[model samples]
Target: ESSVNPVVLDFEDGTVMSFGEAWGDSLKCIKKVSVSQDLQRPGNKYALRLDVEFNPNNGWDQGDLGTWIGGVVEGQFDFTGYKSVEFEMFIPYDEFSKSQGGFAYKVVINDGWKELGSEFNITANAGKKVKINGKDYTVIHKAFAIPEDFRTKKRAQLVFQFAGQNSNYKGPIYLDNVRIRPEDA
Candidate 1:
């Protein structure tokens, strides 16, 4: 066996805004997206956190908060040699139970033009565990393949779209340790 190195986008620098940005142009209610030193894995100090609220006035529409990161450069990342992308997430039980699993996420490439799933249910993340602020919480790790065309393209970007208010769900979501790595051939 041989050791291999992978390209990781762990939000250690508290640089969520730089590596990615959160947009809610059509959002009816307020949603806060920021890099949090307040929440993280046991060994890590930072993660992306989202605090979303619902808006009943807008026809109960909470709108969407889409987050994304590019590859090697700000608008460019080369993943020609990588096989898959792995990401970690932390969702508190309070948020999960309160919404009855209304939170959702979808993967997108080409800056939200190409979506991986129309509706990616995030309720499955429940019952998973990780320590946050010295307490236990449900968390999840997700991994997916990167298509050859998507990886080779210049200025490739990946987006994670979160919409809980749309489903009438509101609470917090934390993300960390996103990596693009190669698997043995």
Candidate 2:
């Protein structure tokens, strides 16, 4: 079983939360937060799910209700020399708005803007491989591999953003678990 330091995120509010929704929403809602069913993705198999989703505002019944992580500040992570990386993601049908809503996945290494895959261009109902700077960032829907600069070195991060071509609403997208580990741990 190969393992790394995992990921420990830190918010500007002096709060520490993990990658998942253990604390509550994607943002640090340590005080007034509830993991409700209405806000949760229907028929979610996982337990650690966000309630209010991310920092969202408006969305539709079945639109691309994307989520956002306020102040994407994170702690330092050195993978202790890992080979490959893999993770899982669950994007609902409303994760991206229909108005040019493209589900783009990205990974930032060492605070470098060089990202993998194309942002806001992911096709709906399907996952696709995204390789930026030659690195596997994440895997979605049990398929599609988004690579980043992980194989080269450590000290990296992964951020996902969804947007509609003409989104009148912001979002309240639901994000569940994010697991990062050795390729063949």
Candidate 3:
């Protein structure tokens, strides 16, 4: 059998305390970070949940949440063999309050040393709907290319930033199954 991609943070080790706000006004917008069983992808016991309150009127357009690969301590992981980083994200439909129709987000790798190369937008109608806690929710599978320069670097960290649309909004976003994938896989 072939080996699967390596997991970065699955939050199954009961180490939910290791992930938190990254920097800047992240704490202002990201109200809380914790492990949640209320919502997760199939086969996962828990997922990292971020309680966010976004207001672009404050002049801070983005809120960041992140975690090091080595839990609470800072550590590095080799990404030379990986072609991209992948993960699952879900934003409950009820939590969205912007006048716009979707969500804006970006993924940063190496703690801002590098990014996914572009910002992405997910429409409220985008993604696939699934039942969680007996309610309907949309789940998105995301992947970003690994920068060639970072392919051989061992110091890597993951950061996710949620952007305020043109209005105020408050909600929770669930993340799970972060991993590094090989070229053909």
Candidate 4:
């Protein structure tokens, strides 16, 4: 029988602070990680917000938000029956304009059992204006296929990565409604 449970992280559990951030030398550049209602997808009350300053001078200049889903105590989830992982993202128009050079983002999935996982790019300038809180913002909807090998695995941790090369960007990024969907559902 195939697994029926769908893993979801909506950031509405009031524990958004539990999520972790990593920026190495760019730690000071990370400004905030909080549950915000300022911008959200329809029907979502809150979303995870990450405010950061991107400077190419930092070398690689990458930052990420990590959310653990399994392996704390040998715990893991079966994804053999899952078809895709989906999520929503938002970047204010003003902030996007202010960002210089270029910035890039992606979502990575890894299990405690493995050293590396799959990475899915979150394409920049690949979104439409969506009204949130009565204001328009560029909102991206992303989905990536679940790797065949990952299906047999037992754990997962999601990492949202933001980076740039010779880029200078400073602004907030919002994420919400992250979930894994079963095949045919």
- Model 3's TM-score against the true structure: 0.81
Assess candidate 4 and give its lDDT. Answer: 0.65
Better of 1 and 2 by lDDT: 1
TM-score of each: 0.72, 0.43, 0.81, 0.78
Off by over 4 Å in 4: 1-3, 22-29, 40-42, 56-59, 70-74, 112-124
Worst 10 residues of 1 by lDDT: 54-63
Q: Candidate 4 lDDT, tens digit per residue, 1-185?
A: 44567777887765573456532443345577888877645577788888877785754567776666642433466667887778887877666755565655666764542323233323345578776777667787777777677766565566666665555767777878888778432
- How would you encode candidate 2's per-residue C-alpha lDDT over 32-110 as one tens digit per residue? 2223232223343332232222222323111111122222435444444443333344333443323343334433332
Give lDDT tens digits, candidate 1, residues 81-185.
776777777777655655543555665665436654444455635548666676566777767776666556444666666655334455666777877678621
Give the residue spans of candidate 2 off by over 4 A: 1-74, 83-101, 128-157, 168-171
Measured by TM-score, how close is model 4 to the native structure? 0.78
The models' CA-based lDDT, in order, is 0.59, 0.34, 0.67, 0.65
- What 10-residue stretch in candidate 2 is worst by lDDT? 60-69
Residue-level lDDT of model 3, residues 1-185, one tens digit each, is 32435656777765574677675456556788889887644677798887877664653356777777556345676666677878787777655523353456777785445877444556445678777877666688877888777766465567777776554666777888777777523
Which of the numbered candidates is closest to the native, going by highest TM-score?
Answer: 3
Highest lDDT against the true fold, candidate = 3
